[PDB]
Amino acid sequence: KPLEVIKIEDGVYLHTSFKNIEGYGLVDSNGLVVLDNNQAYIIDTPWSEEDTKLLLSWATDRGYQVMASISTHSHEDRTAGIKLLNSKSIPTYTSELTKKLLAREGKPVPTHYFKDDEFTLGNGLIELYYPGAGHTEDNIVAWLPKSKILFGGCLVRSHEWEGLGAVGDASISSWADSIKNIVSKKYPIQMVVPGHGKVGSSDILDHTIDLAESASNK
Amino acid sequence: KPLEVIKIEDGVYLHTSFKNIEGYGLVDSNGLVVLDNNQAYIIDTPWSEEDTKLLLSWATDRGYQVMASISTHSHEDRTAGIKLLNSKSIPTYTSELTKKLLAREGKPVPTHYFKDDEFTLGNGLIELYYPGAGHTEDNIVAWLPKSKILFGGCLVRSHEWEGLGAVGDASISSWADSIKNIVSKKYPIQMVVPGHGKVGSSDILDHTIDLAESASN
Ligand SMILES: [Zn+2]
Ligand SMILES: [Zn+2]
Ligand SMILES: [Zn+2]
Ligand SMILES: [Zn+2]
To answer: So where does Ca(2+) get bound (chain A) (predicted)?
Structure first.
């Protein structure tokens, strides 16, 4: 099934892509579009180039100018659309580490990157933070101060999951500490958006800590 | 992780391959190798070409001759290795319907196929039956008379699963009836092997009926 885009706050839209795995069935994958007047910013690409094309069309058919994307780690469900955005001369961003992981794997790289543990896209609109390793070594989160939405990406687990998911690239014994670093930011979080699953409240962070500590102890 | 092969009965081996799905994690997929002396028959290929190569090496390193594979529906977890086996001149089989679905999807096709609802491979070694639509329109099962094992493939669900799984290609309202067609064969089933998850007893058939009927509603 094709990309879905739904409004979740003023100037903030959830975009969701779908993929099938034989045996299990459909899995969903989330990113955001954030609007600033008529400027649009993409937080994580859709899971495929085709779905990325649909997202770009969503924006441009509304008269929005897509200013940039940021991807929150190197995996395909965050970065599949980087190549397409590059081809359209739309600035693409990741952390330095994410960029160099992509380069090492021979994948398309973003045209821009940031070096610090903190950075902003859209001149303050979107605050990025690297809290430490968890789902992957490079996962970052995004804080949207106006809508009070924390985009946790795949570092956070929604309530519908009772496991950490794909952990081949994970640092399980570091994961709880990394969530605690997010909590220490003292963001006035009203909503947390996971990379997979339904939007929830700040208790998603507590749930993720539980899952990480349980897995660590095994 | 790589292919795993483990003995589940004299002359019957479970092969399991793994694929990662971002968001969910590790998923497993099962097939069988069935031996007649040193002649080996593969029920469903592994989930990738690479794991299929490992399965062939497993067999030949043991001095087995791989006679044929049979795939129990068109999906990639059943058929990923057909191309490789074709390239090695190892006969590959599906039902006629499964072959035609593969062709229509532009996927590699088997070199052999059977036309009726029943077919036997080896010398009475493996009995194939098409019970009707369920997981997919083309799903078949394989019955092993000697070991009394039913390979139900992805038409049956293991007890550790709470749902039917991927139903995009399914006929949910037909699924329970199709299981009942299997039951009507009155096979003296002592073990059921699912396409995904742990091997169990014949009660896997009842469990699958329960899931199908619940979903039908
Ligand atoms: Zn990931
Ligand atoms: Zn993800
Ligand atoms: Zn299937
Ligand atoms: Zn399957």
So the answer is: 69
